Amino acid sequence: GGWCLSVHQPWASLLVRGIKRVEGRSWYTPHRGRLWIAATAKKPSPQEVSELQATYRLLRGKDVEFPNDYPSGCLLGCVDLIDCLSQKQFKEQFPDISQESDSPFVFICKNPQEMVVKFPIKGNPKIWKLDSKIHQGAKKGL
Amino acid sequence: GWCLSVHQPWASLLVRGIKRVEGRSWYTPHRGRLWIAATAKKPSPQEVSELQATYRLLRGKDVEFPNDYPSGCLLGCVDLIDCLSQKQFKEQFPDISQESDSPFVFICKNPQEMVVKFPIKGNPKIWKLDSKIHQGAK
DNA sequence: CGGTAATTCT
DNA sequence: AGAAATACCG
């Protein structure tokens, strides 16, 4: 079926944009391939948005094109989770982006996709299974 | 459509009508149809047996219990007719007053049970179902 | 962030 | 079952 990871905004929208290229967690995951991204229920403050955008200007340049909305509580899109590296192997295998994450495990993401219509959703911990009908309509929407 | 997640084996007993109230620590304004989902917590066979004995005391020896108590799924619905404090519970329902000592007691009527139990992930308190999940529930 | 019969897994 | 988690709501 469809497997999903819930992420706090404004990080989540950066992930489905391809602006944020890794996701850092304290725990390891065997999951590979298509990983759906849902924003958690957390509402980001305007400060949180501007501070995160500033940090990514340091990391990816002044001409990063950020999203104009960071909606919470919805399915945003998907990435492909190609690898889950320890922090040590992250630095060694990705020294050009090693600075994007200080977490114990680092989810290596490619092929970011962003949905045009974001389906409302209530998330779960870690990587969890989408209800089959939201998943179906979600891959249709793409 | 609104849902309440309940631990097995209490959850299936609610949709059976065997369990007639749900006691919680908190008040809810919700009235009318309330869907009951089993939480993901699995009861031991021992716990199921002890609970069934308890409900044989309260409802008779020939209570027809469900044959399984599946976890993590939509089970059915009740009508939530009232949410009483423990006092108003003792006053208005003194014949089942012993069935719950909780700060608030949800009075449940018209229990209905689905034939196929749809798997579902719950949320705390009374939470809103997806309208299409709500559709298929009938 | 605390309250919650949320869900996950050794 | 009891830990654990970017669960959810207020």
N-terminal to C-terminal alpha carbon distance within chain A:
16
Element (H, E) at A113: strand A105-114
Report whether the peptide linkage leading into residue A10 is cis, meaning its omega lies within 30 degrees of zero: yes
Burial class (CB in 10 A: 0-12, 13-18, 19+), A117: exposed
Domains of chain A: 3-141 (2.30.130.30)
Element (H, E) at B102: none
What gap in Å lies between CA A8 and CA A28, rounded to an integer? 18
Task: Tell me which amino acid residue A22 is.
Answer: V
Query: For chain A, how many residues are written?
Result: 142
What gap in Å lies between CA A90 and CA A107, rounded to an integer? 9
Task: Tell me which amino acid residue A48 is.
Answer: E
> Across-strand partners of B74?
B37, B118
DSSP strands (E only) in chain B:
2-6, 21-24, 32-38, 73-85, 104-119, 126-128
Task: Select from A124, A128, A133 the Cβ nearest to the Cβ of B132.
Answer: A133
Token output for A33: 């391939």
DSSP state of A68: S
Closest CA to B6 of B52, B41, B39: B39
What gap in Å lies between CA A107 and CA B65, rounded to an integer? 47
Question: What is the CA B35 to C1' C5 distance in angstroms?
Answer: 15
Resolution in angstroms comes to 2.2
Question: Which of B5, B121, B133 should be substituted to probe chain A, the one whose Cβ sees the most A Cβ atoms within 10 Å?
Answer: B121
Radius of gyration of chain A (CA): 15
Residue A68, CA atoms < 13 Å, CB-side half-sphere: 1
What gap in Å lies between CA A8 and CA A11, rounded to an integer? 6
Token output for A138: 């979600």
Is A57 in the B-facing interface, judged by CB distances under 8 Å?
Answer: no
Measured in angstroms, the CA of A23 and the nearest CA of chain B are apart by 24
Q: How far is CA A84 from the centre of its chain?
A: 14
Task: Select from A122, A133, A134 the Cβ nearest to the Cβ of B123.
Answer: A122
Find out whether A106 and A85 touch, Cβ atoms under 8 Å: yes
Question: What is the CA B17 to C1' D8 distance in angstroms?
Answer: 29
Main-chain dihedrals φ then ψ at residue A94, nearest 5 degrees: -145, 55
> Across-strand partners of A109?
A81
Report whether the peptide linkage leading into residue A30 is cis, meaning its omega lies within 30 degrees of zero: no
Question: What is the CA A114 to C1' C7 distance in angstroms?
Answer: 26
Is A74 in the B-facing interface, judged by CB distances under 8 Å?
Answer: no
Method: X-ray
